[PDB]
Design a protein around this ligand. Sequence first.
Ligand code: CDL
Ligand code: PC1
Lengths: 77, 32, 418, 45, 104, 423
Amino acid sequence: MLSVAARSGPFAPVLSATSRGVAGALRPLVQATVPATPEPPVLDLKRPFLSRESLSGQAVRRPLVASVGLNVPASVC
Amino acid sequence: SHTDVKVPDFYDYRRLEVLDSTKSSRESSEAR
Amino acid sequence: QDLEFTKLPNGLVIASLENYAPLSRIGLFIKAGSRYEDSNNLGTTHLLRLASSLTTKGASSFKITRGIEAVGSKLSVTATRETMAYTVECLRGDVDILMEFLLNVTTAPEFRRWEVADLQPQLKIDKAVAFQNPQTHVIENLHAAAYRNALANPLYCPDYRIGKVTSEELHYFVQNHFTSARMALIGLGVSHPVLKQVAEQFLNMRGGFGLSGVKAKYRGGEIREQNGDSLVHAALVAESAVAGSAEANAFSVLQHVLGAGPHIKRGSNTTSHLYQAVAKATQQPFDVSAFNANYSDSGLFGIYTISQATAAGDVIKAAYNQVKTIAQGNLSNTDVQAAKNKLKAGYLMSVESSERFLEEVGSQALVAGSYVPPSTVLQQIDSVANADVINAAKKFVSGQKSMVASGNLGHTPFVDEL
Amino acid sequence: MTRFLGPRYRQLVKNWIPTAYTWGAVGTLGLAWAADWRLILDWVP
Amino acid sequence: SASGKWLDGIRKWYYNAAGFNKLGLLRDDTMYEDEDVKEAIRRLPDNLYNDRMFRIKRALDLNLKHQILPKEQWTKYEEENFYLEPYLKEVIRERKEREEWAKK
Amino acid sequence: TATFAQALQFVPETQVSLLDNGLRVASEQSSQPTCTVGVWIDVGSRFETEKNNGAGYFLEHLAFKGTKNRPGSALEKEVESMGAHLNAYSTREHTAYYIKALSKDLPKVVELLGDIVQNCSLEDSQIEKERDVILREMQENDASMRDVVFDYLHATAFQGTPLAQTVEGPSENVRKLSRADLTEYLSTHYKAPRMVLAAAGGVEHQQLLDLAQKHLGDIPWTYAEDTMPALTPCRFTGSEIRHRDDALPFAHVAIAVEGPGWASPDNVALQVANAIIGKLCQSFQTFSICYADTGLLGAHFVCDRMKIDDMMFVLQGQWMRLCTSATESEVARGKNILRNALVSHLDGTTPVCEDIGRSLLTYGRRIPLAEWESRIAEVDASVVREICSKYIYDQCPAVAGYGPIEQLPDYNRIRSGMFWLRF
Ligand SMILES: CCCCCCCCCCCCCCCCCC(=O)OC[C@H](COP(=O)([O-])OCC(O)COP(=O)([O-])OC[C@@H](COC(=O)CCCCCCCCCCCCCCCCC)OC(=O)CCCCCCCCCCCCCCCCC)OC(=O)CCCCCCCCCCCCCCCCC
Ligand SMILES: CCCCCCCCCCCCCCCCCC(=O)OC[C@H](COP(=O)([O-])OCC[N+](C)(C)C)OC(=O)CCCCCCCCCCCCCCCCC
């Protein structure tokens, strides 16, 4: 009892991972069709902060407030 | 679930050439 | 007719067994896996197991694919956190060329930029089909909660890393971990002389040991994932014992006393203590069972539950209390004997088929100097006492817990209040 | 070309020969019937 | 033997007569993009791809303006780079292999 | 060293015997500490009428729930105290109960196995509990889409014939079936000459035969009054069933023609063809489903809703290709794939036991791997061309679709795809 399968019983198929390579002669069980997750909104890239003068004041000192307006951009404290 | 499935009967429309059953299936197909 | 272990000057282990079967099976086993990654190159091994048909210095991708198809054979790859295995199946007389393919896949891969970059988007898909069964992602979280560094690393690639695993990382990992002293070659349906002819091609490969890694450090973690699902999944464990230990046998017998899984189709599991305990705490559908893992330098034991969202707190508690009564020494000869019966029989059934038999032998070959026949295993099982089982239960009850839960957690308890 | 010399192409051509000569028969008889070509039609009983 | 120097002489003559060097272009820039050539271009690393694109745009602009580069900036025959040849040879090998499989 | 075919000669024989009541006992001995033993029964849904459609599934639910000699959970506790496993299943045409155990336990195993098939305690309380369970199990959409489309296919193909009906049956029936129906079903169908006792593993044949006479020899054999129900003969109809639901993510589709059945030789060649055929869509398969006198031969796939038409085109084109233009090189590959499948399946005692039982019901005899190899070796491209033409070319198919299936081609368009104008 030194393989995962001989030891773990019904938890072996979650304690082990496999990929059967180029297609074989028999047909496997649990074929698993794939409805993948939708893409999030696309955004502009982030700027770095590679100086103390640019990081100065970024650390948080107080909890946040959430805001929105009918003719103003939505904002966060 | 699905298991209650059943096609409704088509008796009125089917050909007599298969109702007069004294001939193997595929040979009938050929005649039709 | 019997197995024959042997070790070459390189340190490579080889073993074989000429069962007169029409289908020959050959496995190459390696000490590698996700535990040897670190935070800077996570996901490498996942792509590595998927890349097992890209081009090599010895044969084109087209050649590998079509040539394996043309004889009807298969080349699988299987991993764990600690080991990887490449396995080949073929009819009698097909060996030689397939062995060339095995050699080139493991000792001389090319990781051409464009083929790797075309292979990336399949990580997402593979992980998705894996994560359809809910058990997998819960167990993944359990390892993250349970350990600080090594056994914590995930089997499937992190999402932020998909599309950004590079060829250089693959080359580095293979060069530093696919080494001859980390390897064994096992053959069923094959005469030792023939397997020697095969192993002969491996004589000039990378020698010695590699990078040894770090020891796993325990965490008393807790991870909660909130979804809308009406069913909640939970796992609660502690640290138990190392692989191949007498204490691990004690823990196994304990698992089978509590209940390891069903035996009758549509049954009530009247023999199972956990199931019967829980059945009196809830009246809607549940599932419960006991959990064991063991590693090279650690192990986990605990309970696993599935219940309705509003019932979770009652279920998880009802299960836990059961274990406690064994720790206090409410345990019976009859239960213990029945558990050992379940365990011996389940073990012998697990190795009827050549596929699993090959796996088991290959696992032993990487860690021991000689093959242990099943009779010896059965005796070792026979040698566990009641006091060992009770001590194991006390270890679980006393030690620091780790917990994971997933679902609608409005009534799940927190690890601190169990 | 030089590509299409080999076993598969020989087998594949043999597969289609009969259909080829049947379409040939169709075309020949049709041409003759359409142009009242006496050279062929005088032999039809 | 001398024959090498002689053949290289005529080859240099033909190269200066062709005149794509007057536009600042390399030989591998001037290929027609058939299927294999497009696949070889797909395989290039980023730096080579970007250099190629700019060189080609620059030649097109000059041709628009019926002009050429200063002589000082012409591509010289003895220090040119056949950057695309290797990739193309691999593409062609792959296609040949597949063909050869298809006749069995 | 041997050849594949020569290794096929070392596989041991299957011994077969008869009791006086006509029950046949079959075994294959493989010198192991573990064994599988079961009873296979020549009964299934295609012998039920609309009045009791669903009886066998009901009986399967309360098979292991108690016998007179072992009331209630005593049977379950005795199975679990040996460390053994117990399983059952039910099909359009067969039924089976088997046990996995240690070879040491054969006398008890057979005993239990005989106690189960002769002495189930059909108690009213347990019947009502199973009724509630099955109704609950039918209420919610607890079926996979694959099962749905295959049930729809059988319904359209074999309409007006017993094979159209499902194993579970309608819900209207489970809320209305009685103990009288269950006991009549058993008395009429569970007769010795329809049963097989099969064993694989570390089992000796003569010991099994002694135990069979001791524990199974009192099963009756006299079919009475020809009480067996009269039923409709087989017919296959070219037809379609379409269930549209544009909210499901993906479209499922199945298309068959009629296959020849268990007995015919042609099956081998067909399998080769299948292996040759099996991108556009996520998932695809080919299949052959055999019965006594008929069968289904076809394919199943899942697609995005905008790619159903192309996929149908590709599939039917491959069919026409095989019928008209096959070649030797691909056929060889298919034969090798088929060899590998046959030898891969028979690994471990359970599949082997199962093969013994199914074989003795369908064929009357165990067919050894050597005979299968000899049958495979005879196929060639000419045989494939001939037989594919004999079953596929210019035939009317049965079609089933479930999902967003607006783009599934019209039936005339599908029928016209079964032949080529250039041939
Ligand atoms: C005018 C009044 C107008 C108003 C009227 C109002 C009312 C109208 C109402 C009705 C409206 C109807 C609308 C149209 C519906 C169309 C439906 C449709 O397309 O369905 C698609 C239908 C559905 O299948 P699918 O799902 O698409 O699957 C596709 C698969 O590939 C399926 O594969 P497959 O193998 O099953 O089928 C493929 C194959 C199936 O067909 C065949 O294999 C053969 C079919 C029978 C034989 C026809 C042979 C014709 C050969 C050319 C003429 C020479 C004849 C001999 C005499 C030689 C003289 C030298 O067909 C083809 O590949 C297409 C071409 C076939 C002919 C080959 C020749 C091509 C060149 C044509 C021009 C030649 C000019 C020079 C001639 C020589 C010099 C004079 O599939 C088709 O592909 C159908 C093909 C239809 C072909 C029609 C050909 C007509 C033209 C003939 C020649 C005319 C010129 C003659 C000149 C004089 C010399 C004789
Ligand atoms: C250049 C001038 C001279 C040209 C002479 C032409 C010679 C050849 C003539 C051939 C005529 C017959 C061809 C039939 C082909 C059928 C193919 C097909 O798909 O059939 C099944 C199809 C579909 O049938 P189906 O769908 O019911 O089932 C078919 C399925 N199988 C094949 C398995 C049975 O039938 C048709 O709808 C075909 C209609 C064909 C209409 C042709 C009209 C005649 C036009 C030519 C004659 C006039 C020439 C005038 C010349 C004058 C010169 C001065």
